[PDB]
């Protein structure tokens, strides 16, 4: 094929990239076909992506193409449109918000769940969830507490510091899980670029949950009402809000159904 000799140089390059770190990550927030994409460097070698998927990049081709691929199980090296060239076709298509936001190598694993931090019957069912990871993936993974108010990310130089800190831990690619204080819901993390993996570490019911705390003793007792409150906003949310729910009755299930999860994000971010 005399297509084979236009793309020798470029396939050449798609080649080198391959055997590249992962410079940095972005999570899409458009679709894009690159098999189809007759422009691209080598045909056939685009990126496939929807919106809200995740892509390393290895490296900047031109100002129109970038070199990396789908954070995916067998997601092989390709071209990548860069921010400009996904916006001309955008321009094409309408007269005929931003596509990437950047976010950690690695998505950090947040337990939200079944109620508020700072009290017993959350923070000892997170323990051991904690405990277990550090368990069974101890090597592979970095686990981290964070006490800033990350849900004020974008005093502010805290946060700022924290932001770029967990993105320093997720660049050797390591599992990253952080035991974030502050982060009851979903939503406080959803305006950031953390892009974390929402884990909702469920409780049979409310009423149960009402005879945990019960059981705990009047200090946690006394605060019921705003245990029981951030319990309802959590069932209340929709389900895209959550990347793993952890709704067995038994721990060991809840956590070989995390562990299976994450050996899943694992495969799918090392290539």
């Given at each position: 094929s005399a297509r084979r000799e236009v793309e020798s140089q470029a396939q050449q390059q798609?080649?080198?990239?391959?055997?590249?770190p992962v410079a940095f990550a972005v999570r899409t927030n458009v679709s894009y076909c690159g098999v189809l994409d007759e422009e691209c460097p080598v045909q056939g070698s685009g990126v496939n992506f929807e919106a809200k998927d995740?892509?390393?990049?290895?490296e900047k081709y031109s100002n129109d193409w970038w070199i990396g691929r789908l954070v995916k199980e067998g997601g092989d090296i390709a071209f990548i449109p860069s921010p400009?060239?996904?916006?001309?076709?955008?321009?094409?298509?309408?007269?005929k918000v931003p596509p990437y936001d950047v976010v950690p190598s690695m998505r950090p694993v947040v337990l939200v769940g079944p109620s508020l931090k700072g009290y017993e019957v959350t923070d000892m069912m997170q323990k051991a969830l904690f405990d277990f990871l550090k368990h069974r993936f101890d090597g592979r993974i970095s686990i981290t507490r964070v006490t800033a108010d990350l849900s004020l990310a974008k005093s502010?130089?805290?946060?700022?510091?924290?932001?770029?800190?967990?993105?320093?831990?997720?660049?050797?690619?390591q599992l990253v899980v952080l035991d974030a204080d502050t982060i009851n819901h979903p939503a406080q993390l959803a305006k950031t670029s953390l892009?974390?993996?929402?884990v909702f570490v469920k409780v049979s019911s409310p009423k149960v949950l009402q005879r945990l705390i019960r059981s705990r003793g009047k200090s946690q007792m006394k605060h019921l009402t705003v245990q029981m409150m951030a319990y309802d906003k959590l069932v209340?949310?929709?389900?895209?809000?959550?990347?793993?729910?952890?709704?067995?009755?038994?721990?060991?299930?809840a956590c070989e159904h995390l562990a299976e999860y994450l050996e899943v994000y694992w495969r799918a971010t090392h290539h």
């Open positions: 798609l080649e080198r990239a391959k055997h590249k995740f892509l390393h990049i290895k400009q060239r996904l916006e001309s076709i955008r321009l094409k298509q309408e007269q502010i130089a805290e946060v700022q510091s924290e932001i770029e800190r967990i993105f320093e831990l997720a660049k050797s690619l892009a974390p993996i929402i209340q949310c929709p389900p895209e809000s959550f990347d793993v729910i952890l709704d067995e009755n038994q721990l060991d299930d």
